Amino acid sequence: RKTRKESYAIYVYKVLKQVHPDTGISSKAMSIMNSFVNDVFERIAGEASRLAHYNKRSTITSREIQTAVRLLLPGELAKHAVSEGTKAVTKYTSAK
Amino acid sequence: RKTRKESYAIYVYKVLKQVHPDTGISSKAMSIMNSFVNDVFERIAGEASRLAHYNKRSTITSREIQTAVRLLLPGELAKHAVSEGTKAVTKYTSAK
Amino acid sequence: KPHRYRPGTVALREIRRYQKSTELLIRKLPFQRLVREIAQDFKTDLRFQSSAVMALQEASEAYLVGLFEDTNLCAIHAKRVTIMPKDIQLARRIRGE
Amino acid sequence: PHRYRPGTVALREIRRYQKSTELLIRKLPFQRLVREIAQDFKTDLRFQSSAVMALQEASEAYLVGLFEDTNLCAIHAKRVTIMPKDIQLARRIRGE
Amino acid sequence: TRFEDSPSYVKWGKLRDYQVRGLNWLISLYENGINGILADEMGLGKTLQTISLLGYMKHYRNIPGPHMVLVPKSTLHNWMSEFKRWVPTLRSVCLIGDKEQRAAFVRDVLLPGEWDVCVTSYEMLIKEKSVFKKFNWRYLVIDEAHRIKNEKSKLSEIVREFKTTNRLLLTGTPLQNNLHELWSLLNFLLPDVFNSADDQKLVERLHMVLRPFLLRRIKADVEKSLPPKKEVKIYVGLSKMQREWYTRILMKKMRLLNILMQLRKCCNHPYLFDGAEPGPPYTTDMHLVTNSGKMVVLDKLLPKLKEQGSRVLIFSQMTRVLDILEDYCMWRNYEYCRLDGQTPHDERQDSINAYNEPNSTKFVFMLSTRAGGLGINLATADVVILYDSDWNPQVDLQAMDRAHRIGQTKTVRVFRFITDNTVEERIVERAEMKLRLDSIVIQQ
Amino acid sequence: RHRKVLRDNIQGITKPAIRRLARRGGVKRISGLIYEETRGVLKVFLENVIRDAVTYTEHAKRKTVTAMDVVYALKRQGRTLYGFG
Amino acid sequence: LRDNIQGITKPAIRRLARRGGVKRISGLIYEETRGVLKVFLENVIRDAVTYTEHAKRKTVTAMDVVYALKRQGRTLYGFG
Amino acid sequence: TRAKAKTRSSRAGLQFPVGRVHRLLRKGNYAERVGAGAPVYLAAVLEYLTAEILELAGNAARDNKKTRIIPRHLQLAVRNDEELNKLLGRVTIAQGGVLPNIQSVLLPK
Amino acid sequence: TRAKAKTRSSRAGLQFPVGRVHRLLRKGNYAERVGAGAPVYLAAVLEYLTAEILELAGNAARDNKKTRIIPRHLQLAVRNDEELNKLLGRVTIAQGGVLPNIQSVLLPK
DNA sequence: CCCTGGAGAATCCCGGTGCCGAGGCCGCTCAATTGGTCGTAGACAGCTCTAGCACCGCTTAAACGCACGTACGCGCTGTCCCCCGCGTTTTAACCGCCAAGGGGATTACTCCCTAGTCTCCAGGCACGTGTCAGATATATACATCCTGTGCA
DNA sequence: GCACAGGATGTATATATCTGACACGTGCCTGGAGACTAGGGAGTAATCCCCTTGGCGGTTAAAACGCGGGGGACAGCGCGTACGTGCGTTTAAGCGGTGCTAGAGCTGTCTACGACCAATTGAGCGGCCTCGGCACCGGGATTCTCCAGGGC
Ligand SMILES: Nc1ncnc2c1ncn2[C@@H]1O[C@H](COP(=O)(O)OP(=O)(O)O)[C@@H](O)[C@H]1O
């Protein structure tokens, strides 16, 4: 067995079972979803890095992630993504 | 006494006097030249960093810089810039 | 009886004149009012540096000039000399906006 | 004998191929073309089959989008036949 | 031991005692080689004294060389008429008009050098600094010198760059806000004396320093008329909507950028803010009056003066407030004439004449506090109501004296409207501070 | 109680000014319906750019929009501007 | 090899145009589209060969092709 | 002794790996330091976007009378939603095809 | 003892700041390690590009009969040359104007 | 000049095959837990220079409204040739299979190249300051455009 | 019907003036060079086995070719309409001012909490098998459409 490779496949599958309980997915579709997740990650992280360099900071923070999602996603997606991220950070802070 | 701002104005003026002894440059043209140098530097450095990540290396080297130059520059510019940089690195390594 | 130029000589003269210069072709104060009105809906109590408005005007004028070049090409494609909203919409659709 | 008018079969083919999701170029000719083109940059090159498949996917997508824009230009000229002038106009407006 | 009577070169007129005293003082300034500031109030023949000075300097001294007078545009014709009437031996030219007229004038009269005095305006000086900069100027006169009271202004820089031998500043209010302005004027005058930026250590020392360079003749030597004024402060309280908006402004969708400027107008009328007025009907009926303290007091005050002597002048610093007052006066059906910056000059003069017509039905003349030209002879009025106070007390004094001119007959009552527990109290306190500074320094 | 509006700010971009822009673009004849279309196009473009610039200004916790913020918004859009920093 | 742009046949171009949504095709479209295809392929293959060379590989990988496409602004999901 | 380890994804109530996102940020040369809330926020955003796309694709697959999501379903979901089409405008999806569309002039009169 | 300091730009023969480029690379978070010859190569490439643009702009200034360069000359140089036009295709030069260009149809005949 | 009537294509329903998707197991390496530290960012204070709001005064360039005439957009018509739809024959793509070895991919080892540190010093930046290149004006010289008219 | 003279317009041209930005010179300080150490990244060699490439034969779909005809491109003509040109009138831009703040940037400090580094260990995750329900393939009966002929 060669070197192990990392993919978001199991997490994508868990989300799919949450959304449609009795619907599956094929290998090419999972590869497409993995590529999508990697691309979105790189877009957001690069934008946040540029923000930190512009403001002369050294730490990537939740405020930078929020500004990056406002910059990159359009409209209702930006609103809902901001709400979801804020909820997650609130739960993490209170439940840690 | 105000803060220190860094710019490539000194070196741009040197290259201007080297390539056209009797010619001057205005402040706004200097702003444009400075912005151009910054933009090219950022493009080359970003492409080199992406290359290093792709090949799972940690060091930006002259091989990475050459490959980024060939990727970014169109053709005659690419080959002449490669020759210029090879000359420079040879001169630096030879007796320095 | 008074001397008059044909319909199209003055248009070509204006084309050459404004392709020879580099100034801004839009009035600064009206443009500033428009920019402030647009930013009002995004966030009230907004203040603008004067250099920001100049950069905005530069970008807007460059965008409009490039759009008009493409519009003229489309009108010439349709075997016309007059540019039309159809030409503007086609240019935008092909460019992907 | 039965004979369809000039244009009904074209519409049927339009619907059929817009319904389908498979490649429309012969794979062996495309592979030979790719290797030929690659001879200009390096010798004795070898390819992964996935590489040729991805190249074909990208090429087909580019051509399909180009033909859509060309069709729009032809409709603008009040025509149904597409022409090389339409292809050139689409490329020029895109920025190529 | 100087000129003791009306000079001879000045024909058709005998200068008064203060006129000849000022002329003697200017001659002493010239003899000692010191430039001076002449501030003898608003009516003691300052233009005549300047004309007499130039007439003397040309007649009894042989220097008919170039002389420049800088004036506001509104006073150019007055200056030319006075030059032609009093001392016609001198040769005076005026520079006005567009670019073609300016070029023709410079090619016809200015450059050929057949003139002796030049009467130009501020704008024409800024335009033609290039040609005025060439000449050697024997005497430079700047009228209404408070225009250049501020350094770092283009006119002050340009007037500093000229080549001059003598300088003379005419003003009535040398001190408006702070001693920096007085130093700016004195530094234009004597740059080598007042080169520095800045009651034995104060008041008396300042008086002794200023006295060799200044001369003020209060309008009390003549008097014999103009019964003294009387200022009454009327305190008013916020209406309920005014209180609601004051709280909304202080606590903090309308942009509120200049908080002081929003609180002010809020203290004038809540209707200025968008949407504070009631809905689409847009009627003028008793909800204008009741929503403003100044407006309720004004409605309680106007009819009493009207059944009394009437002829009231109302001043404000906002044309929006002028609009609201015009609507009120239309609804109550008094007579109103309006004058602000947007009123064309012919209409301005027509309104002044119509109100000043000996027996007219006009009742209220509304002016913007700064829209006059220091003229405006509204001497038939009786009561001045200041809707708004200005940071500059000299502006308020000029507004007052537009109705306190020589033709006045009966005493004038000045009603100043102040909101209690607002920023108007601050404004008035600052104005009092500036006025006390001015009185202690210049008046004494 | 006196209301009198002046004009719409999008009308401040005038027909002769749009004609000058078309002249620099190289256009000879211009239809009368072009002006409203151009006004809409300009509004859309400005809205995108200003939204991004305001996002940057908010992240910096400022209330003043700067030329650098405008430049960064344009680089986000893909319309690099040289000459302002 | 030589004469391989003629392997992209007229029926294939017709199929691609029919997926694009065109009904009538002029006879001169085929040479034009072969030229367009050649220039596009040359750009992509050049970038991919640059990546392959830098890695000191003698094989071109789907990763190299994807990287070239992404640098040209033509992201391709479905291969990695 | 040490308490039972609770994953940060469990603490945040997510289904995406917060720790893996944190390691990817640290190894990516994006910035010198990474805050604690950044991985949680990023994982939540990724989860939301993935859920949106999967929901639309599953709806499309059901309208096709299937049960496995294929690239055709993904492409239909992306191109029939305006926000996701604005996000993925420069993206080509393998074996996705195109949206059925014929211009009205081409239809028979 | 000690030797007199020689700048790396002098060592390499470049008119661009090798040391400043090295520091900018190390602070830009591009990688955790930067080689010795990389700043030299990058500075040489930047110098070549700047020299090209300045040569073309000086030629344009001679054509316009002025001895100082302005953004108009920079735009005329960047356009009219295909390599730099591809390089700066999506770049706007402030007050640079546009190329003179009138279509053949629009001319009188 | 739309209504039946044939034909062709597509759709739906029903039954047999195969192939991987989804589950269950194993092993490992990577994230979570504690503990300690340090440096980054938040908070405060003190200067300086710009931007917003409400006005005024003046000059003048540009917008604006209007009217006329003229290219031009647009519809209509006729002609011709070109692209499409169909049938026949050829060709090479596809698929399955086999075979060989080139190169991708991993591991172990060692060295050499870079990060970090401390001095030392000179190159680059802010600051003043003069002079000259370009903008502008003015008066010509010339090149262009348009019309009327003389000549077939 | 065409071609030219000439008038009027606009434009290119040489000269003279003036001003404000370019370019140079200066002090000093902050960042770059010199010299050293220490450690981990990467170059280098060697092994494995996967995946590429080459070849061959049989099938059959797809390409190439040729025919015949209707529809679409395209040239030409006529018209009336909306845009260009020019002129007189109106408006608002632009410049120069008041008067007061607050906002934001550079300086300089202080300080505390949050991120980093390190050491353990055990649970999550990736790879490997295995099996059955879905997807695919065919087949048959069905519905919708498209084209043609004429009694509507
Ligand atoms: N014949 C006159 N001689 C001198 N002064 C006069 C004469 N007539 C009127 N005045 C004064 O002129 C004043 C108004 O004119 P003003 O513009 O102030 O002139 P000046 O600027 O010369 O004082 C009045 O107060 C009046 O006293």
Author numbering:
A (entry chain D), B (entry chain H): 27 to 122
C (entry chain A): 37 to 133
D (entry chain E): 38 to 133
E (entry chain W): 166 to 363, 377 to 430, 443 to 634
F (entry chain B): 17 to 101
G (entry chain F): 22 to 101
H (entry chain C), I (entry chain G): 10 to 118
Show the paper's wording.
In group B (tracking strand movement, 45% of A-D particles), the DNA tracking strand is pulled out more than the guide strand, deforming DNA locally at SHL2 and SHL3. SNF2H adopts a canonical open conformation, identical to that of ADP-bound ISWI and with similar density for the bound nucleotide,7,8 indicating that group B structures represent post-ATP hydrolysis states. The other group B structures show gradual conformational transitions in SNF2H: relative to the B1 structure, SNF2H moves further outward in the B2–B4 structures, with the brace helix moving away from the nucleosome. By overlaying A1 and B4 structures, we can visualize the extent of lobe 2 rotation toward SHL3 and the outward rotation of the brace helix. The lobe 2 movements pull the nucleosomal DNA away from the histone octamer surface at SHL2 and SHL3, with both guide and tracking DNA strands displaced outward but to different extents: the tracking strand is pulled out by ~6 Å in group B structures, while the guide DNA strand is pulled out by ~1–2 Å in B1 and ~3–4 Å in B4 structure, concomitantly with the gradual outward movement of the brace helix. The dissimilarity in the tracking and guide strand movements results in DNA backbone deformation and base tilting at SHL2 and SHL3, which is necessary to accommodate the 1-nt difference between guide and tracking strands. In the B4 structure, the DNA phosphate groups and bases are in an intermediate position, in between two canonical positions. To accommodate this positioning and local distortion of the nucleosomal DNA, histones H3 and H4 undergo rearrangements, with several alterations in residues in loops H3 L1 (E76–S86) and H4 L2 (A76–T80), which interact with DNA at SHL2.5. For example, the nucleotide 28 in B4 is in a position between those of nucleotides 27 and 28 in the canonical nucleosome. This DNA change induces an inward flipping of H3R83, which interacts with DNA phosphate at position 28 in B4 structure, instead of position 27 as in canonical nucleosome structures.
